[PDB]
């Protein structure tokens, strides 16, 4: 069970750790988050009480180093940093624990929600989508644009999601225009799975990461990416049976976790109606169709 200590909390802020969140008051003696489950990526995220604009946060994996948070009064944000001195870090954590100035990652034993949302998400893949190679953790915020959004302006601060475009030479074989447009199986299976992602696990990892960035930061480009990766599978007549069954579980937990009040901005009506009711895979997403119909029947 790992710990992310906080130097201090000088400004009032809502702190998120994965799907949980805590209000911290200005100068409250808060010194971090303990009992973080090993084996998963995690995201620690912030919304300042005085500017509910710019949700921002850090993807990390405690197996890769000792990370802490420290407020920077110049840049005006909570920053993640790595402590390279193991003994200094262990000594900081032990002191804060002894003084019980740390919140406990509040995982219910029965609850597989975080595993289910992050099943295919790997830190090494996050670090290729979010490029800052001198850090082992990855900064994301509400405003960061995707490589695809930038094509249609600071490259160093971009989300490098795989570009998916249904009306591109990449998506459409010369002489198979109608076939490839109406059945995207060659784009999914040859170009994306065999070509770029190498396997379904990496494809699902990027899909899951795009969703979580959409949900936790309201990142619009991430939402676009999540919907495009769903639509590419649903619009393919030929998908491996294991991928469809796994997609149904992935989407079920995403729809289950989504705040009820954010369905309006985070869910694309056209994509969901097409995927559940018109697409080749309209009958392959039983769990997802049941939770969507019971939770968001307005959208459909």
């Amino acid at each position: 069970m790992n710990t992310v200590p906080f130097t201090s909390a000088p400004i009032e802020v809502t702190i998120g750790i994965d799907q949980y969140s805590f209000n911290v008051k200005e100068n409250q003696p808060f010194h971090g988050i303990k009992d973080i489950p090993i084996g998963h990526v995690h995201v620690i995220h912030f919304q300042h009480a005085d500017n509910s604009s710019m949700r921002y946060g850090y993807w990390f994996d405690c197996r890769m180093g000792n990370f802490y948070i420290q407020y920077d009064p110049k840049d005006g944000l909570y920053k993640m940093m790595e402590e390279r001195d193991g003994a200094k870090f262990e000594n900081i954590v032990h002191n804060f624990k002894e003084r019980q100035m740390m919140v406990s990652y509040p995982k219910i034993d029965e609850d597989d929600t975080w595993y289910n949302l992050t099943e295919f998400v790997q830190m090494d893949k996050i670090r290729k989508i979010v490029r800052k190679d001198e850090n082992q953790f990855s900064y994301v915020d509400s405003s960061m644009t995707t490589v695809q959004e930038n094509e249609l302006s600071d490259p160093a601060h971009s989300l490098n999601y795989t570009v998916i475009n249904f009306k591109s030479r990449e998506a459409i074989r010369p002489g198979h225009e109608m076939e490839d447009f109406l059945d995207k199986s060659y784009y999914l299976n040859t170009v994306m799975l065999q070509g770029i992602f190498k396997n379904s696990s990496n494809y699902f990892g990027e899909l899951q990461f795009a969703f979580l960035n959409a949900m936790f930061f309201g990142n619009y480009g991430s939402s676009l990416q999540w919907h495009a990766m769903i639509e590419l599978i649903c619009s393919s007549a030929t998908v491996p049976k294991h991928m469809l069954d796994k997609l149904d579980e992935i989407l079920y937990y995403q729809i289950k976790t989504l705040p009820e009040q954010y369905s309006d901005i985070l869910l694309n009506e056209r994509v969901w109606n097409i995927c559940l009711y018109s697409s080749f895979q309209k009958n392959s997403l039983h769990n997802t169709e049941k939770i969507m119909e019971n939770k968001y029947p307005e959208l459909l």
Partner: protein, 237 residues
Amino acid sequence: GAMNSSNYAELFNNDIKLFVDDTNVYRVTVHKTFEGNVATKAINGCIFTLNPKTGHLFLKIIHTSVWAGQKRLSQLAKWKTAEEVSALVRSLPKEEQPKQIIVTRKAMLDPLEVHMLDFPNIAIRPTELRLPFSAAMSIDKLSDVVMKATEPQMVLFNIYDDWLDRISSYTAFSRLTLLLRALKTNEESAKMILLSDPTITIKSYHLWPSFTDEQWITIESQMRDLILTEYGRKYNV
């Protein structure tokens, strides 16, 4: 974006553009079977591809053999249209390729866009205009070459005959749209107006009769009257 009333003069500027109408590509007669079910029988069709500035018409005849053993023909018809328009553009010298293609029906946008991916600088546009190009098969010489075709064939016409020797493209397009609107609203009446005086003939190399400037004014008046009558009847106004 969309071609409308507001940006109408753009049709007659010096940027090459084509209208594409797919209405007459997939044509059927509906009939009863022996068992009393209904079936279709396809007849020859055509793509109507028109340069509105020059009058050059690229009439690609669609032979019934292209539908043989295909499913969802009204869907395929849009893709076949886009395939043949793309083939026509690739067949033209670079300096003759259009800078814009305007489709008369919005369902042609995705099929044409996907077939023209090799031409990212050619803009594919819809129109808010309700153009009467469906009535092209009421022009006897165009109907005749489509129905007689025994294989896929491209036939080149000038749909303005020699009008551009005397009038502007704007005026020639207005005359064409009025003739086709009349033919679409009441074909028998329109054809009667065009042939009523046997002394005015159609040249072998023309589609329409050889009217003097004064005769065209009378003809154009008769077509407007035909259109308004029919409108009052349609709506009881």
